[PDB]
């Protein structure tokens, strides 16, 4: 709402037995004042659980006290906008007669694309599970030429599935049992991946764990299940969607040398650097786009054309021969639960 | 920290100061911080004494004990605070103090309690800064900013420390109106 | 120029003088993030011999 | 309301934690994967790390047949669909999240994949909740919160 | 589960607090196991990857 600031804040009510429920209020099974107050927290160790059980004697008194916490989470709005100018002679002495429309359309399309790109950037930024394919510890160590390169493999996607399941991230789809049509297969994917258009060559050749093809294309299960648009295949537990406009860091990898086996490499200050490509999976109910004054829609553009003539004259132009047209909008997201978004950074083949 | 001492015979729980003297018979029942570090203005001498006695056996205060047999009937426990009063700030620095270049501003602070020697100290934070440049020569619990100029605008804070060490503080934002 | 409709980051707006800040600097969404009861897999496979 | 909610969920989770611990501690047929004979000698470095292998699960059932542990689930004899398989799973086995990757990439006696997953046998098998597949004769269930010794 | 909660007010008002401004809520239960046949429980131990 208006007259209410430029940020939105929520509450996250941490459960009792969580490793984030820190509180001073805490009493042991003997009346002592133990530091923590979350019993044993998110500890799946047998010793910790056995030691911190809430044993309470038959003449129960003031033992076994536990506290609770609540965590806030914020998110703001940022503005955007761009324009273009046009002399009257440009629209009056031109071979074409619909230049104004052919610029307004070509501007609105660009604005929509910009909104998509900034949403993609924010999603790739706010990722709780930022997972590095291969043997990379940081972005600077995502290489493609060393003894162990950084390429997407079956084990890495298995690890992403494991991490997403452990974070209690929900499934998006259901497994597809077989059909009766020969040469078809059974996909077993419940998550939805969003690879770029450059990892597909490498992602179409992963040799499973036992050197078998690990990319069941869409044609092998179109009969027995629904087909989501943009699909190219399934891998382990990830129904794969190719995103044509997929953002990719360029030069945020390692140093490039002559041993480069054919992986994409950009240039950052002379010496070439490897390019890092993301594999983004966003879970259900992980973010919300706070639309300010945008009724229903996430982003509402405002057109401000002003035709040259008597509506643009001023002391700065006693003749009034120039106009303009501008588009502006507000955009911003609140990542309420940044544990569903996950990314595999990796290189891509040339 | 306030040492508590219990005398079962007279059911008296004298709350002495850290450096007190367990009265004849009164056994050290334990100590506690009256201005609870976490929640200062949420607890009183009673709460501390009560808990200190909840963990002491009824048969013998000196001997620790728990719920089954402990001193919990506070109705009888006679608490006699023989400890220094909590340093308080009846009068605190005027939240905001607006003036013009020239108008004298006086910041005042009245502290009651703590150890008798209530020392004062004034610190000043310029606008858009973090360092609290201590106002040199100010120990008076009253800072008269006569003929104030635009530079002397900003936040001014006191620190009433008692001989012991407990310190109560108060801040006042001085705003000076400048003119070409 | 009167501006800056939201100084959340300690950046006091123009209209507000000394000892004053915007009454509301954010919106408060009622729906709270809540983790559900953990999945149970061993209590169901039990039996009760009443004592 | 939220305070009471969290209290109750904590109570339920802690109760199942106690059940898990007691069932683990009351195990009669305890076996150790790899070249191990005690907890203190269980390892993960050397010639023989304690990694679950097809032989180890085979030895597990052999004891569960001598000890007369009754079978719980029947065998999937196949479906009419295309890329389904048969399942010899009789007993039900529970695994933590940690050991699942090591079971996914574990070879059978001929050097291939033996982790036929839930997506293969869905038409015939009445797949139970938390299932991830059967290896040889055990139908594996993932336990989101399964305790362990640290 | 047995729950007994007393809200601040008349309920918690006593002589150790003649204002009644301190509530509490407590949950208790009983638990145990009878292991009849221990040979039908077969745990196995190993090490899993990072």
XYZ file of C-alpha atoms in Angstrom:
781
model
C 0.000 0.000 0.000
C 1.000 3.649 -0.429
C 2.160 5.909 2.457
C 3.621 2.671 3.948
C 7.332 2.711 3.029
C 9.356 0.898 0.405
C 9.903 -2.481 2.074
C 7.824 -5.411 3.342
C 8.680 -7.544 6.382
C 7.287 -10.896 7.557
C 7.742 -13.224 10.532
C 9.286 -16.698 10.497
C 8.327 -18.774 13.535
C 11.264 -21.122 14.106
C 10.082 -24.477 15.514
C 11.113 -25.672 18.954
C 13.677 -28.344 18.062
C 15.621 -26.235 15.544
C 19.275 -25.208 15.639
C 18.112 -21.592 15.213
C 15.825 -21.484 18.283
C 18.341 -19.873 20.641
C 16.931 -18.474 23.879
C 18.047 -17.723 27.421
C 14.984 -19.452 28.897
C 16.110 -23.024 29.505
C 16.082 -25.481 32.409
C 17.546 -28.986 32.528
C 16.038 -32.138 34.037
C 17.590 -31.202 37.402
C 16.610 -27.526 37.701
C 19.887 -26.194 36.303
C 19.942 -23.239 33.905
C 21.360 -24.728 30.721
C 22.412 -22.202 28.085
C 20.416 -23.465 25.115
C 16.656 -23.788 25.344
C 15.875 -25.894 22.272
C 16.368 -29.257 24.021
C 18.668 -30.901 21.463
C 17.851 -28.783 18.408
C 18.202 -30.211 14.912
C 20.735 -32.799 16.082
C 20.288 -36.312 14.702
C 23.049 -37.633 16.974
C 22.052 -40.340 19.438
C 24.279 -39.070 22.249
C 22.887 -35.538 22.188
C 19.281 -36.749 22.135
C 19.888 -39.224 24.961
C 21.637 -36.627 27.119
C 19.074 -33.854 26.563
C 15.875 -35.881 26.924
C 13.186 -34.138 29.042
C 13.168 -36.727 31.813
C 10.780 -35.585 34.547
C 10.565 -37.301 37.923
C 7.364 -38.410 39.628
C 7.430 -35.425 41.989
C 7.834 -33.077 39.031
C 8.820 -29.538 39.914
C 10.442 -26.804 37.826
C 12.518 -28.871 35.398
C 12.545 -29.012 31.592
C 11.891 -25.443 30.418
C 12.001 -24.579 26.705
C 11.756 -21.302 24.802
C 10.822 -20.101 21.336
C 11.928 -17.564 18.732
C 10.637 -15.676 15.697
C 12.770 -14.372 12.826
C 11.904 -11.442 10.578
C 12.610 -11.265 6.850
C 12.596 -8.169 4.643
C 12.402 -7.176 0.980
C 12.193 -3.850 -0.854
C 11.255 -2.170 -4.143
C 13.484 -0.632 -6.812
C 12.429 1.553 -9.722
C 13.278 1.434 -13.423
C 12.644 3.451 -16.563
C 13.887 4.475 -20.012
C 12.803 6.695 -22.895
C 13.624 7.763 -26.476
C 13.218 11.030 -28.469
C 12.090 11.684 -32.109
C 12.118 14.804 -34.307
C 8.972 15.643 -36.246
C 10.863 15.508 -39.544
C 11.834 11.924 -38.675
C 8.167 10.859 -38.590
C 7.106 13.201 -41.405
C 9.767 12.887 -44.141
C 10.352 9.143 -43.755
C 9.861 6.373 -46.300
C 7.900 4.375 -43.733
C 4.568 5.720 -42.502
C 4.185 3.709 -39.265
C 7.505 4.477 -37.581
C 5.873 5.593 -34.324
C 4.072 2.271 -33.875
C 7.140 0.280 -34.962
C 9.130 2.044 -32.238
C 6.493 1.841 -29.488
C 6.173 -1.917 -30.017
C 9.952 -2.409 -30.177
C 10.229 -0.438 -26.920
C 7.490 -2.286 -25.018
C 8.998 -5.645 -25.975
C 12.348 -4.463 -24.653
C 10.774 -3.329 -21.389
C 9.147 -6.738 -20.881
C 12.455 -8.475 -21.612
C 14.230 -6.220 -19.094
C 11.696 -7.129 -16.421
C 12.278 -10.820 -17.132
C 16.055 -10.372 -16.937
C 15.979 -8.536 -13.610
C 13.668 -11.186 -12.139
C 16.123 -13.844 -13.309
C 19.043 -11.976 -11.749
C 17.272 -11.647 -8.402
C 16.366 -15.347 -8.402
C 19.956 -16.344 -9.213
C 21.189 -14.029 -6.434
C 18.846 -15.136 -3.645
C 19.645 -18.866 -3.569
C 19.911 -20.689 -0.258
C 21.449 -23.767 -1.886
C 24.286 -22.450 -4.043
C 25.902 -25.694 -5.163
C 29.089 -25.996 -7.214
C 29.394 -28.761 -9.797
C 32.631 -30.704 -10.018
C 35.308 -29.918 -7.457
C 34.912 -26.154 -7.025
C 34.958 -24.420 -3.650
C 34.209 -20.892 -4.902
C 33.123 -19.238 -8.141
C 36.769 -18.351 -8.767
C 37.613 -22.081 -8.745
C 35.046 -23.207 -11.331
C 37.449 -24.419 -14.011
C 37.170 -26.663 -17.055
C 40.748 -27.743 -17.713
C 42.238 -29.101 -14.490
C 42.689 -32.713 -13.463
C 39.138 -32.538 -12.131
C 37.019 -30.120 -14.207
C 33.726 -28.480 -13.218
C 31.072 -30.092 -15.421
C 27.570 -31.215 -14.511
C 27.509 -34.928 -13.673
C 24.913 -37.383 -12.400
C 26.278 -37.362 -8.844
C 25.962 -33.576 -8.601
C 22.289 -33.641 -9.598
C 21.758 -36.484 -7.132
C 23.288 -34.263 -4.444
C 21.051 -31.344 -5.442
C 18.012 -33.617 -5.172
C 19.192 -34.807 -1.752
C 19.739 -31.255 -0.491
C 16.347 -30.111 -1.773
C 14.620 -33.089 -0.139
C 16.400 -32.476 3.175
C 15.373 -28.797 3.233
C 11.774 -30.132 3.067
C 11.305 -28.427 -0.326
C 8.109 -29.854 -1.862
C 7.866 -31.790 -5.099
C 6.410 -30.085 -8.169
C 5.312 -33.070 -10.283
C 4.653 -36.793 -9.955
C 6.500 -39.804 -11.304
C 5.295 -41.172 -14.640
C 4.677 -44.905 -14.773
C 5.049 -46.541 -18.154
C 2.808 -46.713 -21.194
C 2.072 -49.575 -23.581
C 3.887 -47.968 -26.527
C 7.172 -49.641 -27.433
C 10.511 -47.767 -27.116
C 9.014 -45.528 -24.428
C 10.512 -45.356 -20.945
C 9.728 -44.387 -17.338
C 10.829 -41.009 -16.029
C 11.088 -40.612 -12.277
C 11.376 -36.856 -11.893
C 9.468 -34.737 -9.397
C 11.545 -31.527 -9.532
C 11.702 -29.058 -12.423
C 15.083 -27.834 -13.661
C 15.724 -24.676 -15.697
C 19.022 -25.196 -17.549
C 20.255 -22.677 -20.080
C 20.694 -23.265 -23.808
C 24.435 -23.928 -23.428
C 24.508 -26.755 -20.866
C 22.207 -28.902 -23.036
C 25.142 -30.298 -25.094
C 26.903 -31.423 -21.905
C 23.695 -32.313 -20.038
C 22.739 -34.550 -22.990
C 25.759 -36.816 -22.489
C 26.018 -37.692 -18.763
C 26.973 -41.349 -18.333
C 24.838 -42.110 -15.252
C 26.821 -43.934 -12.586
C 27.454 -47.042 -14.719
C 28.102 -45.527 -18.144
C 24.523 -45.621 -19.411
C 22.631 -42.799 -21.093
C 21.084 -40.613 -18.403
C 18.939 -38.287 -20.513
C 15.458 -39.586 -21.337
C 14.149 -37.214 -23.996
C 10.560 -35.989 -24.057
C 9.633 -38.342 -26.902
C 10.034 -41.379 -24.619
C 7.221 -40.423 -22.246
C 4.830 -38.106 -24.109
C 2.145 -40.790 -24.223
C 1.904 -41.664 -20.525
C 2.240 -38.208 -18.968
C 1.737 -34.495 -19.424
C 4.379 -32.431 -21.216
C 5.359 -29.094 -19.708
C 6.311 -26.461 -22.261
C 10.000 -25.832 -22.832
C 10.833 -29.428 -21.900
C 13.758 -31.238 -23.491
C 14.069 -34.319 -21.268
C 14.409 -35.685 -17.753
C 17.464 -36.538 -15.650
C 17.207 -38.592 -12.444
C 14.672 -36.388 -10.622
C 14.573 -33.136 -12.650
C 12.108 -32.490 -15.463
C 14.275 -30.198 -17.553
C 13.043 -26.917 -19.060
C 15.281 -25.096 -21.525
C 15.111 -21.336 -20.919
C 16.185 -19.466 -24.097
C 17.099 -16.289 -22.200
C 19.173 -17.798 -19.389
C 21.495 -15.427 -17.543
C 25.060 -16.673 -17.157
C 28.071 -15.191 -15.401
C 30.873 -14.531 -17.887
C 34.406 -14.596 -16.523
C 33.514 -15.580 -12.956
C 35.433 -18.840 -13.239
C 39.147 -19.646 -13.246
C 42.126 -18.742 -15.401
C 42.037 -20.010 -18.984
C 45.132 -21.583 -20.541
C 46.017 -23.511 -23.698
C 44.851 -26.752 -22.055
C 41.241 -25.524 -22.426
C 39.484 -28.602 -23.867
C 36.773 -26.528 -25.541
C 34.771 -24.866 -22.773
C 33.273 -21.392 -23.126
C 35.651 -18.645 -22.002
C 35.075 -14.892 -21.815
C 37.613 -12.108 -21.178
C 38.092 -10.126 -17.955
C 41.017 -7.663 -17.947
C 43.247 -9.381 -20.465
C 43.725 -13.021 -19.469
C 40.631 -15.011 -20.389
C 38.437 -16.512 -17.669
C 35.990 -19.402 -17.735
C 32.253 -18.729 -17.903
C 29.942 -19.979 -15.142
C 26.492 -21.248 -16.082
C 23.667 -21.768 -13.575
C 21.199 -24.632 -13.168
C 18.355 -23.011 -11.262
C 15.468 -24.838 -9.590
C 12.979 -22.688 -7.663
C 10.573 -24.426 -5.305
C 6.963 -23.660 -4.516
C 6.210 -20.619 -2.355
C 9.755 -19.256 -2.115
C 9.313 -15.625 -3.188
C 6.699 -12.987 -3.925
C 6.959 -9.930 -6.166
C 5.641 -6.928 -4.246
C 3.720 -4.920 -6.824
C 3.367 -1.278 -5.800
C 0.178 0.216 -7.293
C 0.280 -2.587 -9.870
C -3.251 -3.973 -9.567
C -2.909 -7.759 -9.734
C 0.002 -7.814 -12.170
C 3.547 -8.011 -10.837
C 4.751 -4.996 -12.855
C 2.659 -2.154 -14.305
C 4.283 0.043 -16.943
C 3.308 3.689 -17.513
C 3.499 5.169 -21.007
C 4.240 8.884 -21.321
C 4.360 9.734 -25.032
C 4.220 13.430 -25.960
C 3.759 14.161 -29.657
C 5.832 17.032 -31.092
C 3.747 20.125 -31.717
C 2.132 22.639 -29.375
C 2.441 20.274 -26.387
C 6.260 20.358 -26.262
C 7.158 23.997 -26.975
C 8.929 26.042 -24.303
C 11.599 28.681 -23.860
C 14.099 25.896 -24.582
C 12.465 25.346 -28.006
C 10.390 28.305 -29.244
C 9.606 26.239 -32.365
C 8.482 22.994 -30.715
C 9.850 20.299 -33.014
C 10.805 17.413 -30.680
C 8.962 14.940 -28.485
C 9.633 11.841 -26.387
C 8.108 8.675 -24.960
C 9.039 7.041 -21.661
C 8.214 3.800 -19.848
C 8.694 3.437 -16.085
C 7.796 0.788 -13.530
C 8.400 -0.455 -9.989
C 9.791 -3.900 -9.227
C 10.875 -5.871 -6.181
C 10.565 -9.304 -4.621
C 10.326 -10.696 -1.087
C 12.096 -14.046 -0.724
C 10.058 -15.348 2.206
C 11.697 -18.798 2.250
C 15.133 -18.734 0.602
C 15.720 -22.459 1.059
C 13.820 -23.728 -1.995
C 15.914 -21.882 -4.591
C 18.930 -23.958 -5.627
C 21.637 -23.452 -8.261
C 24.405 -25.581 -9.785
C 27.152 -23.369 -11.163
C 29.168 -25.103 -13.875
C 30.963 -24.516 -17.164
C 29.432 -25.281 -20.557
C 30.954 -26.779 -23.712
C 31.827 -24.424 -26.549
C 25.686 -9.036 41.789
C 23.917 -9.158 45.194
C 24.867 -11.913 47.711
C 21.779 -13.286 49.568
C 22.029 -14.821 53.087
C 19.287 -16.921 54.756
C 18.777 -17.539 58.506
C 16.343 -20.513 58.785
C 15.780 -19.708 62.515
C 14.260 -16.275 61.689
C 13.446 -17.131 58.034
C 15.275 -13.867 57.149
C 16.859 -13.506 53.662
C 19.100 -10.407 53.877
C 20.158 -9.292 50.365
C 23.673 -7.903 51.067
C 25.814 -6.186 48.376
C 28.599 -8.152 46.603
C 30.970 -6.993 49.399
C 28.547 -7.490 52.342
C 28.860 -9.708 55.463
C 26.607 -12.794 55.990
C 24.811 -11.901 59.279
C 25.278 -14.264 62.260
C 23.508 -17.510 61.225
C 22.532 -16.238 57.750
C 24.119 -18.876 55.421
C 25.223 -17.654 51.943
C 22.255 -18.851 49.811
C 23.867 -17.491 46.596
C 24.170 -14.288 44.513
C 22.183 -12.722 41.621
C 22.213 -9.529 39.482
C 19.333 -7.266 40.620
C 19.299 -5.280 37.298
C 18.941 -8.551 35.331
C 21.525 -8.169 32.512
C 19.000 -9.454 29.918
C 15.826 -7.822 31.322
C 16.853 -5.013 33.728
C 13.476 -3.311 34.302
C 11.553 -6.641 34.412
C 12.755 -8.221 37.712
C 13.031 -7.068 41.368
C 15.088 -8.152 44.466
C 12.261 -10.650 45.295
C 12.506 -12.701 42.071
C 16.248 -13.301 42.654
C 15.861 -14.212 46.368
C 12.868 -16.480 45.521
C 14.865 -18.538 42.950
C 18.006 -18.595 45.181
C 15.810 -20.138 47.948
C 13.912 -22.473 45.539
C 17.214 -24.350 45.044
C 17.959 -24.609 48.826
C 16.670 -27.564 50.951
C 14.032 -26.770 53.626
C 15.631 -28.960 56.371
C 18.899 -26.958 55.982
C 19.052 -23.823 53.758
C 22.851 -24.248 53.604
C 22.297 -27.688 51.985
C 20.957 -27.443 48.382
C 17.590 -29.097 47.622
C 14.858 -29.185 44.949
C 11.019 -29.002 44.528
C 10.225 -32.000 46.842
C 11.885 -30.259 49.824
C 12.994 -26.597 49.444
C 12.223 -23.084 50.823
C 9.387 -21.820 48.563
C 6.844 -20.281 50.988
C 7.991 -16.672 50.359
C 5.013 -15.648 52.561
C 7.334 -16.359 55.541
C 10.733 -15.475 53.978
C 11.568 -11.984 55.355
C 13.692 -10.199 52.710
C 15.829 -7.332 54.165
C 17.719 -5.538 51.344
C 21.058 -4.425 52.871
C 22.400 -3.619 49.363
C 23.193 -0.329 47.550
C 20.161 1.266 45.850
C 19.810 0.750 42.062
C 21.292 3.804 40.252
C 18.195 5.447 38.637
C 17.731 8.614 36.481
C 14.686 10.564 37.836
C 15.648 13.412 35.459
C 17.103 12.475 32.051
C 18.563 14.637 29.221
C 15.714 16.374 27.283
C 15.082 13.955 24.348
C 15.406 16.837 21.792
C 16.618 20.458 22.366
C 16.065 22.892 19.434
C 17.822 26.309 19.529
C 19.135 29.016 17.158
C 22.801 30.034 16.646
C 23.215 31.874 19.993
C 20.414 30.438 22.169
C 22.022 28.809 25.244
C 20.910 25.161 25.838
C 21.256 23.433 29.254
C 21.167 19.614 29.410
C 20.297 18.317 32.928
C 20.392 14.817 34.544
C 19.447 13.880 38.170
C 20.671 10.436 39.366
C 19.484 8.791 42.620
C 20.980 5.625 44.185
C 24.219 3.688 43.583
C 27.354 4.299 45.672
C 27.420 7.848 47.145
C 30.200 9.244 44.830
C 28.073 9.721 41.669
C 30.712 10.813 39.088
C 29.443 12.384 35.814
C 30.937 12.367 32.284
C 29.643 14.060 29.089
C 30.290 12.716 25.553
C 29.261 14.387 22.249
C 28.522 12.748 18.881
C 28.640 15.129 15.872
C 25.856 14.650 13.258
C 26.530 11.823 10.757
C 29.285 10.273 12.944
C 29.943 7.239 15.213
C 32.728 8.391 17.588
C 31.370 9.895 20.834
C 33.914 12.734 21.314
C 33.769 13.114 25.121
C 33.100 16.784 26.070
C 36.309 17.701 27.998
C 35.700 19.478 31.353
C 32.009 18.646 31.858
C 31.652 16.538 35.060
C 28.790 18.687 36.437
C 25.624 16.697 35.561
C 24.634 19.950 33.742
C 26.093 21.120 30.384
C 25.306 24.796 29.554
C 25.936 25.245 25.781
C 25.961 29.091 25.874
C 26.191 31.000 22.538
C 25.836 27.618 20.747
C 26.803 27.545 17.028
C 25.826 25.104 14.227
C 28.904 22.904 14.911
C 27.808 22.212 18.525
C 24.622 20.533 17.166
C 24.267 16.728 17.440
C 23.758 14.174 20.244
C 25.027 14.729 23.838
C 25.191 11.799 26.309
C 25.998 11.587 30.068
C 27.396 8.595 32.039
C 26.523 8.815 35.758
C 28.963 6.219 37.190
C 28.810 5.441 40.929
C 31.959 4.710 42.998
C 31.138 0.993 42.480
C 30.982 1.274 38.655
C 27.278 0.968 37.712
C 26.584 3.754 35.184
C 23.214 5.252 34.072
C 23.301 7.201 30.753
C 20.945 9.670 28.971
C 21.152 11.371 25.530
C 19.749 14.640 24.112
C 19.737 15.680 20.416
C 20.689 19.412 20.314
C 19.515 21.126 17.074
C 21.015 24.585 16.285
C 19.290 26.890 13.736
C 21.886 28.614 11.512
C 21.394 31.859 9.506
C 23.349 33.140 6.457
C 13.509 19.248 -2.472
C 11.057 17.252 -0.354
C 11.804 13.639 -1.297
C 12.845 10.155 -0.159
C 9.510 8.617 0.877
C 11.179 5.779 2.799
C 14.294 6.167 5.001
C 14.571 2.624 6.388
C 18.386 2.753 6.325
C 18.819 5.727 8.655
C 18.608 8.304 5.867
C 16.025 10.733 7.308
C 13.684 12.227 4.716
C 13.387 15.942 4.006
C 10.064 16.728 5.702
C 11.153 15.162 8.984
C 13.159 17.398 11.312
C 15.128 16.672 14.459
C 13.692 13.937 16.661
C 11.249 12.623 14.072
C 11.061 9.704 11.656
C 8.363 8.131 9.494
C 5.704 6.440 11.615
C 5.485 3.514 9.199
C 8.581 2.512 7.231
C 7.311 -0.865 5.986
C 4.287 -3.105 5.553
C 3.655 -6.047 7.881
C 2.311 -9.172 6.181
C 0.101 -11.228 8.492
C 0.887 -14.676 7.059
C 3.880 -16.023 8.993
C 6.411 -18.510 7.646
C 5.734 -21.762 9.509
C 7.422 -25.159 9.315
C 5.046 -28.109 9.485
C 5.082 -31.091 11.823
C 7.904 -33.428 10.836
C 6.991 -36.590 8.949
C 6.449 -39.580 11.231
C 7.530 -43.069 10.186
C 7.813 -45.233 13.299
C 4.964 -44.460 15.707
C 2.393 -45.849 13.194
C 4.121 -49.258 13.189
C 3.554 -49.767 16.902
C 1.209 -51.788 19.098
C -0.221 -51.102 22.537
C -0.239 -53.640 25.349
C -2.215 -51.630 27.883
C -0.771 -51.551 31.393
C -1.537 -20.157 19.399
C 1.838 -20.461 17.669
C 3.550 -21.148 20.994
C 1.184 -24.045 21.708
C 1.566 -25.312 18.145
C 5.351 -25.410 18.421
C 5.105 -27.073 21.838
C 2.921 -29.869 20.468
C 5.059 -30.489 17.380
C 8.149 -30.575 19.569
C 6.483 -33.153 21.805
C 5.481 -35.393 18.886
C 8.888 -35.174 17.211
C 10.732 -35.843 20.473
C 8.507 -38.850 21.165
C 9.360 -40.371 17.795
C 13.009 -39.527 18.479
C 12.849 -41.610 21.660
C 11.203 -44.462 19.755
C 13.941 -44.319 17.107
C 16.704 -44.350 19.712
C 15.203 -47.238 21.677
C 14.585 -49.353 18.576
C 18.170 -48.737 17.457
C 19.516 -49.679 20.895
C 17.362 -52.837 21.100
C 18.765 -54.427 17.926
C 19.430 -58.149 18.179
C 20.885 -58.924 14.751
C 23.521 -56.214 14.506
C 25.841 -56.349 11.486
C 28.726 -54.150 10.371
C 29.389 -53.350 6.725
C 32.849 -54.012 5.359
C 35.798 -55.331 7.339
C 34.470 -54.253 10.726
C 33.544 -56.067 13.920
C 32.756 -53.163 16.261
C 31.824 -49.493 16.259
C 35.352 -48.484 17.266
C 36.766 -50.278 14.209
C 34.199 -49.066 11.661
C 36.106 -46.875 9.211
C 36.082 -45.210 5.818
C 39.770 -45.203 4.893
C 42.042 -48.041 3.802
C 41.550 -51.063 1.596
C 38.105 -51.911 3.031
C 35.918 -48.948 3.986
C 32.617 -49.763 5.665
C 30.449 -49.240 2.586
C 27.159 -51.094 2.129
C 27.656 -53.688 -0.620
C 25.343 -56.139 -2.363
C 26.911 -59.025 -0.450
C 26.258 -57.261 2.860
C 22.536 -56.906 2.155
C 22.536 -60.518 0.986
C 24.082 -61.611 4.285
C 21.521 -59.455 6.108
C 18.546 -61.353 4.703
C 20.201 -64.754 5.192
C 20.225 -64.041 8.925
C 16.659 -62.727 8.715
C 15.610 -66.082 7.239
C 17.441 -68.198 9.817
C 16.012 -65.984 12.576
C 12.568 -66.631 11.021
C 11.751 -62.934 10.620
C 8.428 -63.093 8.728
C 8.305 -61.449 5.325
C 6.217 -58.280 5.134
C 5.765 -57.436 1.439
C 5.112 -59.634 -1.580
C 7.065 -59.699 -4.850
C 6.092 -57.654 -7.903
C 5.856 -60.146 -10.766
C 5.737 -57.423 -13.432
C 3.318 -55.150 -15.241
C 1.971 -54.877 -18.782
C 3.724 -51.538 -19.409
C 6.992 -51.075 -21.287
C 9.963 -50.159 -19.085
C 8.786 -51.736 -15.841
C 10.738 -54.425 -14.014
C 10.149 -57.172 -11.473
C 10.932 -56.800 -7.776
C 12.084 -59.419 -5.289
C 11.609 -57.173 -2.275
C 10.214 -59.019 0.741
C 11.346 -57.141 3.868
C 11.116 -53.401 4.530
C 14.340 -51.493 5.190
C 14.743 -47.961 6.560
C 17.652 -45.696 5.616
C 18.716 -42.206 6.570
C 19.265 -39.502 3.994
C 23.046 -39.813 4.339
C 23.345 -43.409 3.126
C 20.977 -43.013 0.152
C 23.675 -41.787 -2.309
C 25.883 -44.759 -1.425
C 22.986 -47.134 -2.092
C 22.144 -45.411 -5.389
C 25.590 -46.124 -6.892
C 26.076 -49.654 -5.545
C 26.804 -52.563 -7.894
C 25.190 -55.998 -8.053
C 27.062 -59.288 -8.515
C 27.553 -58.695 -12.267
C 28.722 -55.076 -12.094
C 25.591 -53.088 -12.933
C 22.824 -51.033 -11.307
C 20.747 -52.695 -8.590
C 18.577 -49.893 -7.228
C 15.346 -50.366 -9.193
C 13.536 -47.200 -8.173
C 9.879 -46.467 -7.502
C 9.300 -45.089 -11.004
C 9.925 -48.495 -12.593
C 7.393 -50.550 -10.607
C 4.325 -48.392 -10.082
C 1.608 -50.188 -12.015
C 1.797 -53.409 -9.994
C 3.439 -52.503 -6.695
C 1.351 -50.676 -4.105
C 4.276 -48.382 -3.315
C 4.353 -47.361 0.339
C 5.072 -43.852 1.578
C 8.694 -42.735 1.620
C 9.725 -45.516 -0.762
C 12.798 -44.992 -2.936
C 13.065 -48.509 -4.352
C 14.199 -52.077 -3.636
C 17.740 -53.366 -4.041
C 17.620 -57.149 -3.795
C 14.935 -58.239 -1.327
C 14.573 -55.117 0.875
C 12.157 -52.320 0.001
C 13.860 -49.126 1.150
C 11.975 -46.344 2.941
C 13.641 -42.986 3.508
C 13.243 -41.636 7.038
C 13.492 -37.813 6.896
C 14.607 -37.730 10.534
C 16.657 -40.861 11.197
C 19.082 -40.758 14.116
C 22.746 -41.743 13.963
C 25.828 -42.173 16.131
C 28.331 -39.323 15.929
C -0.175 -35.994 25.815
C -1.533 -34.195 28.880
C -1.630 -30.393 28.732
C -2.423 -28.083 31.654
C -2.147 -24.356 30.913
C -3.161 -21.535 33.261
C -3.517 -18.056 31.790
C -2.556 -14.952 33.793
C -5.363 -13.600 35.925
C -7.409 -15.224 38.671
C -5.975 -18.695 38.039
C -2.303 -17.979 38.734
C -3.023 -15.413 41.465
C -1.800 -16.671 44.863
C 0.219 -15.401 47.865
C 3.627 -15.957 46.208
C 2.259 -13.531 43.595
C -0.787 -11.470 44.604
C -1.196 -9.892 41.171
C -1.498 -12.903 38.876
C 0.766 -11.928 35.980
C 2.698 -15.145 35.280
C 1.263 -17.999 33.230
C 2.617 -21.399 32.276
C 1.818 -24.389 30.081
C 3.132 -27.921 30.541
C 2.826 -31.128 28.512
C 3.554 -34.576 29.969
C 3.198 -38.201 28.884
C 4.355 -41.761 29.549
C 6.416 -43.971 27.260
C 8.145 -47.337 27.124
C 8.926 -50.378 25.004
C 8.564 -54.129 25.506
C 10.970 -55.891 23.143
C 9.579 -59.413 22.861
C 11.686 -60.766 19.988
C 14.983 -58.867 19.565
C 16.256 -61.143 16.777
C 13.712 -59.663 14.345
C 15.380 -56.225 14.548
C 18.468 -56.069 12.326
C 20.404 -52.812 12.342
C 23.494 -52.393 10.161
C 26.208 -49.753 10.463
C 28.386 -48.058 7.851
C 29.814 -44.705 6.755
C 28.115 -42.478 4.193
C 29.746 -39.869 1.941
C 29.916 -36.181 2.813
